[PDB]
Amino acid sequence: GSMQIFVKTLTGKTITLEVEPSDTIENVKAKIQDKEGIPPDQQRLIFAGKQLEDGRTLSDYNIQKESTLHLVLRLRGG
Amino acid sequence: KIHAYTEGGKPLRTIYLPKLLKKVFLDVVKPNTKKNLETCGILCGKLRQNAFFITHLVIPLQEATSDTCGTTDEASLFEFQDKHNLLTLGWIHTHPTQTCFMSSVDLHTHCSYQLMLPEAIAIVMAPSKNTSGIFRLLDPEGLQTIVKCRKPGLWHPHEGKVYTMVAQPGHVREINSKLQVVDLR
Ligand SMILES: [Zn+2]
Ligand SMILES: [Zn+2]
Secondary structure, three states: OOEEEEEEEOOOOEEEEEEOOOOEHHHHHHHHHHHHOOOHHHEEEEEOOEEOOOOOEOOOOOOOOOOEEEEEEOOEEO | OOOEEOOOOOEEOEEEEEOHHHHHHHHHOHHHHHOOOOOEEEEEEEEEOOEEEEEEEEEOOEEEOOOOEEEOOHHHHHHHHHHOOOEEEEEEEEOOOOOOOOOHHHHHHHHHHHHHOOOOEEEEEEHHHOEEEEEEEOOOHHHHHHHHOOOOOOOOOOOOOOEEEOOOOOOEEEEOOOOEEEEOO
16 A cells, blocks of 8 residues: 554554555555454454444544554354 | 463463453353353453453354354454454353364464464363363464364374373462353343
8 A cells, every 4th residue: 555554552553554545444454454364253453432334434534644543343152 | 470481492481361261161151061061261351461361251243053063253253352442362162962072173274373373372161071171282383283273074083192281280270260151142
């Protein structure tokens, strides 16, 4: 991609991604599965207090160079 | 004085678990366990001098049935942890009627926590059997198995030993410490 954003976790990690403004949130998750091994449906991404929907894009949410997103995992118990 | 290692020889930092937490969790989710409903929560806390301290049990917004439970509004969970600088150190849930083990769903869920934090633990309460367990995936073989896994269906099986009970007291040590219980439901 053509800019870099950061994904900070609740575990002291910081993931760095290269992405396009036109990358979908679902694309950003796929890049995280690639880099960290986490399935997309287990991820929730959060920016400026709002949770990001799979079908929208980084531009839809005004996410620019070197912005920080936040990753919170879902919990599924059996 | 005592160090625990993964199967592959990586050292695990110690997590201090309040002795109270298991008992208080069962108490907090007892309405659901009576109604034959699974419940879950998050183990949160802090890193002090190369050790983790569980300080908060957080009951997130969730939906449940008799054999499943899942979070629904992770944003409020996030807001709480971030606002209070809480690390995620693992999770806990009930088997209202089943035995004390990690199901296929538990393994896939936990794989992600243990990837984000090598020491992450999964506590399983089987109150109808009066047992409980604290588990993790084998590192690296079990992590690798579940990460690569693409099998469909909720309850599918896995090839080989995938998880194990955590080392006590080297990895997890139960101690008499303070606890906050945060109910976000
Ligand atoms: Zn379970
Ligand atoms: Zn699987």
